[PDB]
Amino acid sequence: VTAASGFVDLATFSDLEAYLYGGCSAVTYFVRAIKKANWFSFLPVVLRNISGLPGFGSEFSASVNRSGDYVLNTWLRVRLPLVAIRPTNTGGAINANATIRWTRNFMHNLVEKVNITFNDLIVHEFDSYWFDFNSQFNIDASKRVGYRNMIGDIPAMINPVTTGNPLGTGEFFNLPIPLFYTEDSGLALAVSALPFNDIKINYCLRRWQDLIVLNVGVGGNPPTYDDIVQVSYDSTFTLIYSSNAPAITNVETWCHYAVVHNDERVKMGKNPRDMVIKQVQKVNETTINLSQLNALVPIDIRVSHAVVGYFYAIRNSSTTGEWSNYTTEPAYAGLDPLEAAQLVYESTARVSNGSDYYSLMVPWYWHKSIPEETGYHAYSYSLDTFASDPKGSTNYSKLTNVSNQYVPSTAAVNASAGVTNTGIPIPSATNPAVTQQNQTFQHIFRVLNFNVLRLSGGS
């Protein structure tokens, strides 16, 4: 009981169907035209051995060789050995409730600002907050679990443990950073950089403290910071310790390279060209007061070049290592502190309402994805443009009296005084103090932009 050839559909070609289906438009739709391409095979390589001593408390800077031709992707590679706190530093350690934790985002937070330099300037720049944002908006609804499996994803790095039992995972972590090369634009190494560019890359790292936390326990024999030490599994499967402070062994950057026919390389030097690309900026983060009620006391300002969109947020660390919190919650994800924000202006304001607007009703209408139930406020007054395709923009050179405007919520102040809804006290991780928390707050921001690049020699 099935159809062989229903076939009646085709019989109905009236006007409505006529405008579209028939006529001089795609004489065939089933087949595909094919557009040939270039000759290029690209296999990765490691970069030179990196200046400076790398790994936690330094600012090392790699380089690039010119043997390749283009550059397409980029990332960082690391190892991390097991770490767990120990007893018997002096008469044992805390008998009962020893603790040990880690951040929620490690290789995002670990890295400090990064950027590239062409020996006279800068064209690129970043921060931890930026990976934090880009984890949500500019990455698929599907690829998130992979992203995380590559970094900071596991009840080994979270869901902490007591002292004896170990923690961590003795493997590598992969972290990608986009470095002027999201959309396969590509670079003219052998043509441009050759005389004097002296391409180079830079980093800046952090003290393992700022990434870690620990609630010293009760018992008159509390732990500390330096008692932390590496761990290992022997041949016979038993815990083994050391004195060596925790650290990452191998720090190397792995970048792809593409080669081409010598000709394609020759078409380049004869003629210079200009490129259009993105980058970021920032404003020196500042402390702020969110403790008063729904009356607009707080203020803030901003400055930048012409851009496409701009992102903002909050953070209330109030703790030595519970980074990337973004809430009136000290130890774990919480609700948003603020609402009913706005952007101050003089005339034809670019916003006139909304907080939840920003996070949600804007992406579904503009952006690619949306965030989780934590709160990464955001806004664009042009298209996504993540594809370097210019779709709407504006300048900041003008409206010289630029600024922004902010405002708290009830939960915000309830926390700033050490409480939440229903008169609830808040504890602290760094120490046991059931209440009496005056949770410090902060304000943060970032922004993209467009610029124009010329490179006949260096850039």
**Gap between the Cα atoms of 109 and 63, Å rounded:** 23
**Gap between the Cα atoms of 228 and 205, Å rounded:** 19
**Gap between the Cα atoms of 79 and 61, Å rounded:** 18
CA angle 37, 253, 52 (to 5 degrees): 140
Q: How many CB atoms lie within 10 A of CB 440?
A: 15
> CB under 8 Å to 285, separation ≥6 — which residues?
442, 443, 444, 445
Among 369, 331, 351, residue whose Cα is nearest residue 406: 351
Please give the method by which this entry was determined: cryo-EM
Token code pair at residue 381: 């007054």
Long-range contacts of 122-126 (CB under 8 A, 24+ apart): 123/180, 123/279, 123/451, 123/453, 123/459, 124/179, 124/180, 124/279, 124/280, 125/279, 125/280, 125/281, 125/282, 126/177, 126/280
Q: How many residues does the chain have?
A: 459
> CB under 8 Å to 443, separation ≥6 — which residues?
285, 286, 287, 288, 300, 312, 314, 406
Rg over CA atoms, the chain: 27
**Gap between the Cα atoms of 127 and 232, Å rounded:** 33
**Gap between the Cα atoms of 82 and 79, Å rounded:** 10
- 39-271 and 274-459 have identical folds: yes
Q: What 3 state SS string does the chain have? A: CCCCCCCCHHHCCCHHHHHHCCCCCCCCCCCCCCCCCCCCCCCCEECCCCECCCCCCCCCECECCCCCCECCCCEEEEEECCEECCCCCCCCCCCCCCCECCCCCCHHHHCCCCEEECCCCCCCCCCHHHHHHHCCCCCCCCCHHHHHHCCCCCCCCCCCECCCCCCCCCEEEEEECCCCCCCCCCCCHHHHHCCCCCCEEECCCCCHHHHCCCCCCCCCCCCCCCCCEECEECCCCCEECCCCCCCCCCCEEEECCECCCHHHHHHHHCCCEEEEEEEEECCCCEECCCCCCCCCCCEECCCCCCECCEEEEEECCCCCCCCCCCCCCCCCCCCCCECCCECCCCCCCCCCCCCHHHHHHCHHHCCCCCCCCCCCCEECCCCCCCCCCCCCCECCCCCCCCCEECCECHHHHHHHCCEECCCEECCCCCCCCCCCCCCCCEEEEEEEEEEEEEECCCC
Among 62, 283, 102, 346, residue whose Cα is nearest residue 208: 102
Q: Give Cα separations from 130 to 134, 181, 389 (angstroms).
A: 6, 16, 21
Taking every pair of C-alpha atoms in the chain, what is the biggest distance, in angstroms?
Answer: 92
For residues 366, 371, 375 and 376, what is the CA-based torsion angle, rounded to 10 degrees? -60
Q: Which residue has the tokens 């970048």?
A: 255
Token code pair at residue 18: 């006529």
CA angle 284, 322, 425 (to 5 degrees): 110
Listed resolution, Å: 4.4
CATH architecture of the domain covering 274-459: Distorted Sandwich (2.70)
Q: Is 8 exposed, middle or buried (0-12, 13-18, 19+ CB in 10 A)?
A: exposed
Domain residue ranges in the chain: 39-271, 274-459
Contact 383, 392 (CB under 8 A): yes
Token code pair at residue 412: 């915000």
Q: Which residue has the tokens 């590559």?
A: 150
> CB under 8 Å to 84, separation ≥6 — which residues?
100, 161, 163, 164, 165, 166, 167, 168, 228, 231
For residues 411, 414, 419 and 422, what is the CA-based torsion angle, rounded to 10 degrees? -70
Token code pair at residue 347: 């005339």
Among 209, 76, 71, 203, residue whose Cα is nearest residue 127: 203
Q: With the C-alpha atoms ordered 367, 372, 375, 376, is the resulting torsion angle positive or negative?
A: negative
Q: With the C-alpha atoms ordered 65, 68, 69, 71, is the resulting torsion angle positive or negative?
A: negative
> CB under 8 Å to 171, separation ≥6 — which residues?
79, 80
**Gap between the Cα atoms of 360 and 339, Å rounded:** 13
Token code pair at residue 425: 């006290």
Contact 274, 451 (CB under 8 A): no
Token code pair at residue 150: 């590559």
**Gap between the Cα atoms of 68 and 42, Å rounded:** 9
What CATH topology corresponds to 39-271? Adenovirus Type 2 Hexon; domain 4 (2.70.9)
